[PDB]
């Protein structure tokens, strides 16, 4: 199976058995000069033009890979199977979103500024670095970035020109919805961008458990099965909060987790970050089932 095939990290598209990605917090991460603290189970289905010659055809091999990736961002969006595209009772909610997070992992890919992984894809970080010097003069360190530099609005429409190809379809999709530009900012750096999917990611869960537990409780019986499957999820959890939510508070000094999370998406607002992760026992104790034990008492 190669060739970038409809997505897998949060299960199959419907109506498929499942084979759900998760994410890998590697421990080997206590230096300065790696991506980020667990990988998002999106940068691990990313879309490959064959990343098992010359940089003017390097360049296609990617402006491509980021068309197809895009646009099987759009099914598994569309249809509602991606973990963050979920509702509950223009384009796809979340679709952009992930878009931008797979354009990032790419400059980062092509750049080597990556978190080392897959080997077939981290093996090319090699095959780029190695092609632009017998592309362009100096000797260059940052040579290789230079020249992104002056391709990134090629790829951004390797972006721009997918959604396009949609329109009509299901018109007012000018390609611009996602931004007219690629992503920057506090994006501008990996380990944010997973960072910030992986609270985008949780919130819409949390708020995905309210809304069963809510809808399921109108003592004992089911507002308890569905409870427990709740302290469940940040039993798992706790461990990838704390992971990243350290690596983020160290290396950019002075910041704090919760409000890059809350400051990026509707869903966190409504959640307390320390608060559902807190660290003494006796809270094991008072609130079996976290901020919800309102809700499941």
């Known amino acids: 199976i190669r060739g970038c095939q409809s997505k897998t990290y949060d299960g199959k598209?419907?109506?498929?058995?499942?084979?759900?990605?998760?994410?890998?917090?590697?421990?080997?991460?206590?230096?300065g000069d790696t991506n980020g603290a667990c990988i998002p189970p999106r940068t691990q289905n990313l879309c490959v033009g064959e990343l098992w010659d010359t940089k003017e055809l390097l360049k296609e091999k990617?402006?491509?890979?980021?068309?197809?990736?895009?646009?099987?961002?759009?099914?598994?969006?569309?249809?509602?199977?991606?973990?963050?595209?979920?509702?509950?009772?223009?384009?796809?909610?979340?679709?952009?979103?992930?878009?931008?997070?797979?354009?990032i992992d790419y400059k980062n890919m092509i750049l080597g500024t990556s978190v080392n992984i897959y080997e077939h894809i981290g093996k090319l970080q090699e095959d780029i670095k190695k092609i632009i010097e017998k592309g362009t003069p100096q000797q260059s360190t940052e040579n290789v970035n230079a020249w992104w530099k002056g391709i990134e609005r090629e790829m951004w429409d390797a972006v721009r020109c997918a959604i396009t190809k949609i329109n009509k379809k299901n018109s007012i999709f000018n390609g611009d919805e996602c931004g007219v530009s690629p992503p920057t900012g506090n994006d501008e750096d990996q380990s944010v961008s997973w960072f910030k999917?992986?609270?985008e990611q949780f919130c819409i869960e949390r708020l995905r458990?309210?809304?069963?537990?809510?809808?399921?409780?109108?003592?004992?019986g089911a507002c308890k099965r569905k409870c427990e499957k709740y302290k469940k999820y940040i039993s798992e959890k706790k461990q990838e909060w704390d992971k990243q939510k350290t690596k983020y508070e160290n290396k950019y000094v002075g910041k704090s987790a919760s409000d890059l999370l809350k400051e990026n998406y509707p869903e966190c607002i409504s959640a307390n970050f320390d608060f559902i992760f807190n660290d003494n026992i006796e809270y094991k104790t008072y609130y079996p089932y976290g901020d919800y034990s309102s809700i499941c008492s």
């Open 62 to 103: 990617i402006k491509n890979a980021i068309h197809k990736e895009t646009e099987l961002l759009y099914e598994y969006h569309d249809t509602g199977t991606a973990i963050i595209s979920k509702n509950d009772k223009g384009l796809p909610k979340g679709f952009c979103h992930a878009v931008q997070r797979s354009f």
């Open 13 to 31: 598209i419907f109506p498929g058995k499942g084979g759900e990605k998760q994410w890998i917090c590697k421990d080997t991460i206590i230096h």
């Open 197 to 199: 999917e992986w609270g």
């Open 209 to 220: 458990y309210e809304q069963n537990i809510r809808e399921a409780c109108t003592i004992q």
